[PDB]
Amino acid sequence: GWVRPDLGDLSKVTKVKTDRPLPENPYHSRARPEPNPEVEGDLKPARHGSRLFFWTM
Amino acid sequence: RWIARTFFDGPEKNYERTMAILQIEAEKAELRLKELEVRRLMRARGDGPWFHYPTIDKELIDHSPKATPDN
């Protein structure tokens, strides 16, 4: 008394059951590591203007 | 007597102009002693975005369970 699985088999991704603990903190996952800080500030213009050699403005 | 007040001034204009344009200097010769402080000696930190070089974009990675379990 069995079935003839014509087309429904080998498809339709399922879920099963919670059986064992899910392996969080995977295979190594050592560090990120840390990023470098940014600047937000306040966009002011040039302090006296382009300051190159003589170049007042 | 009638030469100065007809033409020019003494220690009220040519003094305190020397005091005026010598305050455009200490914000010029000292900010030029901060570029050498920062640009040449940044150096191995790379904190401020001047030596920032592109490496890779991690957005284009995939995370699907691709069809070999040990990869």
Short mmCIF file of C-alpha atoms in Angstrom, two decimals:
data_model
loop_
_atom_site.label_atom_id
_atom_site.label_comp_id
_atom_site.label_asym_id
_atom_site.label_seq_id
_atom_site.Cartn_x
_atom_site.Cartn_y
_atom_site.Cartn_z
CA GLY A 1 0.00 0.00 0.00
CA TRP A 2 2.30 2.79 -1.20
CA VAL A 3 2.10 5.84 -3.46
CA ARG A 4 3.10 6.68 -7.02
CA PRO A 5 4.81 10.08 -6.61
CA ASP A 6 4.34 11.33 -10.18
CA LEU A 7 5.64 14.93 -10.06
CA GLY A 8 5.31 16.27 -6.50
CA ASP A 9 8.53 14.64 -5.31
CA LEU A 10 12.01 16.23 -5.66
CA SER A 11 10.61 19.75 -5.35
CA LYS A 12 8.86 22.04 -2.83
CA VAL A 13 11.45 23.03 -0.22
CA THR A 14 10.07 22.21 3.23
CA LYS A 15 10.83 22.78 6.88
CA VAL A 16 11.46 19.83 9.14
CA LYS A 17 11.54 20.25 12.95
CA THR A 18 13.70 21.81 15.66
CA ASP A 19 15.86 18.88 16.77
CA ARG A 20 19.38 20.08 17.66
CA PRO A 21 20.74 23.55 18.49
CA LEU A 22 21.19 25.76 15.42
CA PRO A 23 24.93 26.46 15.02
CA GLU A 24 25.05 30.19 15.67
CA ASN A 25 28.50 31.82 15.96
CA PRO A 26 29.62 29.90 12.86
CA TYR A 27 32.74 28.04 11.75
CA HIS A 28 35.18 30.64 13.00
CA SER A 29 33.75 34.19 12.69
CA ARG A 30 36.82 35.69 14.37
CA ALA A 31 36.19 39.45 14.24
CA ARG A 32 34.75 42.07 11.97
CA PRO A 33 37.25 43.99 12.92
CA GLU A 34 36.59 47.58 13.97
CA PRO A 35 36.03 50.37 11.41
CA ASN A 36 37.58 53.81 11.39
CA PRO A 37 35.60 56.83 12.65
CA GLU A 38 34.07 59.41 10.33
CA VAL A 39 33.47 63.15 10.46
CA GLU A 40 30.09 64.90 10.36
CA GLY A 41 31.11 68.39 11.48
CA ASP A 42 29.85 71.58 9.86
CA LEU A 43 30.72 72.65 6.32
CA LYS A 44 32.33 76.04 6.74
CA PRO A 45 34.21 77.74 3.88
CA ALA A 46 37.98 78.20 3.74
CA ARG A 47 39.50 79.90 6.76
CA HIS A 48 41.29 82.60 4.77
CA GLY A 49 41.11 81.16 1.25
CA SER A 50 43.26 78.57 -0.52
CA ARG A 51 46.45 79.43 1.48
CA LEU A 52 48.77 78.34 -1.32
CA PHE A 53 51.66 80.77 -1.66
CA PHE A 54 50.38 84.37 -1.46
CA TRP A 55 46.82 83.94 -2.75
CA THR A 56 44.60 86.12 -0.55
CA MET A 57 41.28 85.03 -2.06
CA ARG B 1 51.87 122.42 8.55
CA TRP B 2 49.62 122.14 5.48
CA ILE B 3 51.18 119.10 3.88
CA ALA B 4 50.18 116.15 6.08
CA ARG B 5 46.47 116.83 6.69
CA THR B 6 46.19 117.67 2.99
CA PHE B 7 47.77 114.37 1.91
CA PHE B 8 48.26 111.52 4.41
CA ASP B 9 48.49 110.41 8.05
CA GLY B 10 50.94 109.27 10.70
CA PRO B 11 50.68 106.83 13.63
CA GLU B 12 46.97 106.18 13.36
CA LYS B 13 46.85 104.39 9.98
CA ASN B 14 50.32 103.03 9.20
CA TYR B 15 50.28 101.78 12.75
CA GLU B 16 47.48 99.24 13.49
CA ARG B 17 47.60 98.26 9.83
CA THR B 18 50.82 96.52 10.77
CA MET B 19 48.80 95.17 13.69
CA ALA B 20 46.02 94.32 11.22
CA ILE B 21 47.75 92.39 8.43
CA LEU B 22 49.98 90.56 10.93
CA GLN B 23 46.91 88.72 12.14
CA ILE B 24 46.31 87.32 8.66
CA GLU B 25 49.68 85.58 9.16
CA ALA B 26 49.34 83.47 12.30
CA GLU B 27 46.34 81.72 10.75
CA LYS B 28 48.35 81.26 7.55
CA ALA B 29 51.82 80.19 8.69
CA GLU B 30 50.32 77.89 11.33
CA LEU B 31 47.78 76.07 9.19
CA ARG B 32 50.67 75.49 6.80
CA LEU B 33 52.37 73.85 9.78
CA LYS B 34 49.39 71.52 10.13
CA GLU B 35 49.38 70.11 6.59
CA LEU B 36 52.91 68.83 7.18
CA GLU B 37 51.66 67.58 10.54
CA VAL B 38 48.80 65.63 8.96
CA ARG B 39 49.38 64.92 5.25
CA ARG B 40 52.97 63.66 5.44
CA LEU B 41 52.46 62.10 8.88
CA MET B 42 49.03 60.53 8.64
CA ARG B 43 50.46 57.74 8.24
CA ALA B 44 49.86 54.12 9.04
CA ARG B 45 46.50 54.85 10.65
CA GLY B 46 44.68 56.16 7.58
CA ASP B 47 41.92 57.56 9.78
CA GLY B 48 41.13 60.79 7.94
CA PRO B 49 40.01 60.06 4.39
CA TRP B 50 43.13 61.09 2.48
CA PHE B 51 44.93 57.75 2.17
CA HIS B 52 41.64 55.87 1.69
CA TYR B 53 42.09 53.26 -1.00
CA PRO B 54 39.34 51.00 -2.38
CA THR B 55 39.60 47.30 -1.62
CA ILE B 56 36.37 45.38 -2.37
CA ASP B 57 32.60 45.79 -2.11
CA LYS B 58 31.02 43.13 0.09
CA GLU B 59 27.53 43.82 -1.29
CA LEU B 60 28.10 41.50 -4.25
CA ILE B 61 28.59 38.38 -2.12
CA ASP B 62 25.89 35.68 -2.14
CA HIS B 63 24.44 33.70 0.75
CA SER B 64 22.24 31.03 -0.82
CA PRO B 65 22.75 27.37 0.10
CA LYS B 66 24.76 26.64 -3.04
CA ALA B 67 24.66 23.06 -4.26
CA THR B 68 27.74 21.61 -2.61
CA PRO B 69 27.68 21.38 1.20
CA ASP B 70 31.46 21.46 1.72
CA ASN B 71 32.87 24.43 -0.16
#
